[PDB]
Write a protein that binds this ligand. Structure first.
Ligand SMILES: CC(C)(COP(=O)(O)OP(=O)(O)OC[C@H]1O[C@@H](n2cnc3c(N)ncnc32)[C@H](O)[C@@H]1OP(=O)(O)O)[C@@H](O)C(=O)NCCC(=O)NCCSC(=O)c1ccccc1
Length: 284
């Protein structure tokens, strides 16, 4: 079937249920936890059955998804116990609008077979990004049962990130470099607390952001200030903030990025037996 969850009680029940399927459910779990805190991206949680769902989809509002080309906006978060149920659910036009450029995100690699099955039926092309999934050791101990080297306090200060910094974040983001990606980064900065390090000029020189899924993403250091431990400090401070508020700490790393594999090991972030996935789907 198809049920729209409404209210904190139902979202809290969903968040509790998803804890039993971490880390495969992590991408959905993080999204729901941040929904339960003002729902700044105006998302909604769909299930095939309630309370004992087999499939959950987090999706945006139809009237926010005006630009068929804005795959940053057109993002869906999915987790399923039953791939047949999942394929029947994603087949419903009320669940996913396959006529737009869109992104499916999941920490469940087995959905690959479902998305490939629908590509035939729904007339879309798919490109998969599959990366190493990391979780903080502390999140693993809390949900599924490491300090940086110090830096010079009169050179670097912890700061909030102004929406005006989006243009710089956008220049260094592997998925960015365009106007739609800039707008998405601005929405993440406006919606969620983020950390940067200000350098000697009071300008941001290192940063780490969070998106609507609660994942730590879009981190960078200006070339002039690289290899001094700055991004490790920014991510450490972001992670401790999330942990204090009972949010999961997680991230991913492309296998090309050895630097962020090293950073992750230094902070006791652990590679998981689930992968990070993003399926980029566009109509034929
Ligand atoms: C952000 C980096 C990648 C690193 O920033 P920096 O401040 O320079 O890094 P640190 O100084 O803290 O060093 C860390 C470790 O690397 C080592 N090390 C460092 N440099 C080198 C070197 N050249 N050659 C060799 N080794 C080098 C250094 O010794 C240290 O080793 P230890 O940990 O002590 O064992 C920066 O180069 C950049 O902006 N790149 C482009 C954008 C991009 O790729 N962004 C990231 C996209 S992924 C993402 O967003 C994300 C992922 C997970 C969680 C959250 C988010």
């Amino acid at each position: 079937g198809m049920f729209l969850l409404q209210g904190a009680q139902m979202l809290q029940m969903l968040e509790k249920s998803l804890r039993k399927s971490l880390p495969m459910s992590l991408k959905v779990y993080g999204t729901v936890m941040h929904m339960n805190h003002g729902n700044p991206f105006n998302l909604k949680a769909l299930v095939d059955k309630w309370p004992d769902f087999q499939t959950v989809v987090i999706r945006p509002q139809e009237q926010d998804m005006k630009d068929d080309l804005d795959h940053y906006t057109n993002t869906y978060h999915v987790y399923s116990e039953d791939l047949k149920n999942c394929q029947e659910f994603l087949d419903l036009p009320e669940v996913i609008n396959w006529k737009q450029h869109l992104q499916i995100q999941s920490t469940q690699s087995s959905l690959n077979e479902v998305i490939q099955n629908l590509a035939a039926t729904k007339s879309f092309k798919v490109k998969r990004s599959k990366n190493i999934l990391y979780m903080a050791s502390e999140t693993i101990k809390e949900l599924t049962p490491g300090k940086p080297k110090a830096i010079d306090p009169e050179m670097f200060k912890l700061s909030s990130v102004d929406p005006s910094h989006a243009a710089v974040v956008n220049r260094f983001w592997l998925f960015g470099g365009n106007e739609r990606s800039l707008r998405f980064i601005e929405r993440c900065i406006q919606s969620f607390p983020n950390f940067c390090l200000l350098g000697p000029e009071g300008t941001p020189v290192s940063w780490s952001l969070m998106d609507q899924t609660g994942e730590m993403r879009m981190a960078g250091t200006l070339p002039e200030y690289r290899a001094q431990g700055l991004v490790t400090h920014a991510i450490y401070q972001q992670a401790q903030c999330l942990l204090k508020r009972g949010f999961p700490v997680y991230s991913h790393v492309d296998p090309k990025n050895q630097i962020m594999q090293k950073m992750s090991q230094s902070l006791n972030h652990v590679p998981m037996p689930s992968d990070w996935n993003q399926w980029n789907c566009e109509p034929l």
